[PDB]
Amino acid sequence: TVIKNETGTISISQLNKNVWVHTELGSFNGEAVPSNGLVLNTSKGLVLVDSSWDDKLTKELIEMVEKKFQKRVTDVIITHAHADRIGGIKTLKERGIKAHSTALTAELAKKNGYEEPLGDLQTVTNLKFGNMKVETFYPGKGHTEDNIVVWLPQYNILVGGSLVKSTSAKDLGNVADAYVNEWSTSIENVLKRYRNINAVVPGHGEVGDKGLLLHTLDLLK
């Protein structure tokens, strides 16, 4: 289930047959800062939900999964325009890895000096990679104005991203780019759209269930 790398900075934990969570530790702020993403093992190659803090980590992550699953990373879904999500955009672009995002995430990325992801995702976009079905959903502003969630309909698995706080998060964290008055409605939009969720992957911390969305709503009070 769990697989680390050279230094411990990169680890992958299996949720299921074709779905794994990737977690990388940062260096700026706290003393570690562990971000989560997903690795989708499809029949057409590997698909990642979010990159990492920087190019160095993004390269390692890619090389780790490509060697392990014996297929190439073909696409990446960027959940918002913050560093730990879009930091390795330069690596993805130069290797020919498709970087999907909403037009708003792309716009913000460019404004902040990062290379632009595709800006192809709408409010609701349905993608399919080989066998793997993936739906992206913009539920409104919250953690950032552009944050989106990712849903795997075949597993009822929701990648909540930074819009969703783990049980360990006792506060909202970085709210510099957040919309605390709209974040609750956005969370409600997710709950209304996905009434039956098996697992919820937060932007950082332990995987949980619908309870993390409820936990986030409480943190917003």
Q: List the catalytic residues.
A: 80, 82, 84, 143, 174
Q: Which of 16, 23, 1, 11 is nearest to 202 (CA)?
A: 23
Among 101, 162, 184, 186, binds Zn ion (CB under 5 A): 162
The stretch near Zn ion (CB under 5 A) out of 70-78, 82-90, 128-136, 152-160 is 82-90
CB of 62 to Zn ion, least distance (A): 21
Binding mask 96-135 for Zn ion (x = CB under 5 A): ----------------------------------------
Round to whole Å and give the CA distance between 114 and 108.
Answer: 9
The pair of three-digit structure tokens given for residue 109, joined into one six-digit string: 């990325």
Mention every residue, 6+ apart, whose C-beta is less than 8 A from residue 11: 2, 3, 4, 5, 22, 23, 24
Question: Residue 132 or residue 143: which is nearer to Zn ion going by CB?
Answer: 143
186 binds Zn ion (CB under 5 A): no
Angle of helix 211-219 relative to helix 183-193, nearest 10 degrees, comes to 160
Q: Which residues bind Zn ion (CB under 5 A)?
A: 82, 162
